[PDB]
Structures are given as structure tokens and as C-alpha cells.
Amino acid sequence: SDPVRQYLHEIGQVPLLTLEEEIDLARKVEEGMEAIKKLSEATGLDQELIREVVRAKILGTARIQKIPGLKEKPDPKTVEEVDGKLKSLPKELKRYLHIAREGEAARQHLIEANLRLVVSIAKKYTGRGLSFLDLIQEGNQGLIRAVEKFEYKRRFKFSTYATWWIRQAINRAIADQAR
């Protein structure tokens, strides 16, 4: 497939993370999630809503843009409104917004650096009801779930935890396609 070949081409340019970059990114993601909790408490808005909007603002400096199976940006009207409430917060709370920005910049980076992993697991599940693209989308959503639950303090490699999640996602999608 032409869009697929192009996708594989694009993700292949993304270098693998060292262990040290991995921990740094994972740390920034934790920190970003605690910051967004503080912003939620202070504004009364949904944590995931804040996260999505902050994320929408960091995608400008992203390397891979249309990632298959990833949730789409909210509608710009909601971005503008929520972004407005955040920018307008008090001095003390604007450092939390900075931390949340790096957290979401780091999430995106960490995700891009492991798209190659999903593809390789995907390859083991072809001919089972779902196209390759479909496998990648289901795999990608496992990846995202892994970034959310990964605990770097455990000292296990990200690929270890990510792989578990990616298989779960792919195994569930096959069993649902099959009634």
C-alpha cells in the first residue's frame, strides 16, 4: 500500500531512544500528568480535556503528524476556548502549564520513537482478519495505553511493557473481528 509504504518510510527516520533519553522522557510525562491534575483542580475542567488541548498546542513541533489509530485533535473552537482559560491563569499556576507542555511534548516524542516497534509486532499478526493498516492502528492504540501506564522506576525497558500492551491490543482486535 502506498500510504503505508510512506508511513513506514517516515517512522524509520525516527531514531531509537537510549535508556537515558527514555527515563528522561518518561519522567517528564509523569511530571506533566501531575501538573495537569493541578490545572484541573484549579480550573474545574477535565484532566483529559486539558491534556488534549495542551497536546494540540505541541503538535506543531511534532515529527510524525497523522499517526494511524491515534485520537484526533478536538475541534479548534474547543482548543481556543480551553487554551484561553489556561493562558489566563495566575502566576503560580503558569509553571504547571509549562510542565504540562513539556510532559505532552515528551509523550509525543516517546510515542514516535516506538512506532517502529508496533510495526514489527504487527507483522506477526497478518492474515488473521485485519489488514496491515488495521493492525498498525490497533497496535498504535496499545502503544498509547502503554505510555499512560508505564512506570520507569521499575527499571524495565519501555519495549518490554510496550510489547505486552501492543499484543493485547492486537489480540483483542482480532477476537472482536471474529464475533
Added chain:
DNA sequence: GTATAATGGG
């Protein structure tokens, strides 16, 4: 709650 590492494959 799900955790060896795994990102061409074995």
C-alpha cells in the same frame, strides 16, 4: 493490574 527485551528476524 497487566513489566527480561524486543524497534529487519531468529
